[PDB]
Backbone:
């Protein structure tokens, strides 16, 4: 299988390790791991275009959107390639991440390797929020931690 | 694509930002930037196989070596793809990096996107030391700082 990994860090207490595995060419990508230091509830979770952390998470730019679509949720046909929805933290501030997605890839034009994974302050409204930002960013707010997605063994 | 970036970090603090640019896929990659916090003199400088920083720089594994060749200097035919030689720090502990390399790439099978850039404790002996490690690691010693190479705007 092809594999990738991302270490999430930021300016505050949020940190985690996220794994990716794609067993078959153009097949589903399994995304799993854990994030700690976040508030209980849902937090937006996306791949952003640039693997640039020079000024922290802001340097990663907008959502990864090679097909020029509107923002949505991962279950929607209308979404950015990088739109992985929300992750959910428990009362301890720990989110167990377990996603399977077939729009991201670990090769080709939808490849996410070398791009940035970002966990946000607020929930992503999945494009359902009724204001213009909703179909751009999902209103997920500030970037609490990020990392560059790297090739894994 | 045509640009990449890497934020190097390690204990010291050792800190740097390294940029990569490739005009066309059949051309060389320019590698430039600055590294601070290291001892005066030459330090080994390589792309390692994995973009995995989970336990720091050790997690990046061996030099990026898709052809299974021996370790060398950047000028040599017999080298690893990731063998970028040495960078040189001044009395103030700052290295100004300025390399052009024809073997690394920002696309294709020698693509370094999603891999780890590492600066070392010691100089790289370019495979011309007397010992068996010379033609594996160049005897560059510990890993002072690293980061994952990301796609840049
Ligand atoms: Cl959802
Ligand atoms: Cl040299
Ligand atoms: Cu995001
Ligand atoms: Cu090295
Ligand atoms: Zn989006
Ligand atoms: Zn080498």
Residues:
């Amino acid at each position: 299988a092809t594999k990738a990994v991302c270490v999430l860090k930021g300016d505050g207490p949020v940190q985690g390790i996220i794994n990716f595995e794609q067993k078959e060419s153009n097949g589903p990508v399994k995304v799993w791991g854990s994030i700690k230091g976040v508030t209980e509830g849902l937090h937006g979770f996306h791949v952003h275009e640039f693997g640039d952390n020079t000024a922290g998470c802001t340097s990663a730019g907008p959502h990864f959107n090679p097909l020029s679509r509107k923002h949505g949720g991962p279950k929607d046909e209308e979404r950015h390639v990088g739109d992985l929805g929300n992750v959910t933290a428990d009362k301890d501030g720990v989110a167990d991440v377990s996603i399977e997605d077939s729009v991201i890839s670990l090769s080709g034009d939808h490849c996410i390797i070398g791009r940035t994974l970002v966990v946000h302050e607020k929930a992503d409204d999945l494009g359902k929020g009724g204001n213009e930002e909703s179909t751009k960013t999902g209103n997920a707010g500030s970037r609490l931690a990020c990392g560059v997605i790297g090739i894994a063994q």
Remarks:
- The pocket of chloride ion (ligand 2) is lined by residues B 73-75, 85, 126 (CB under 6 Å).
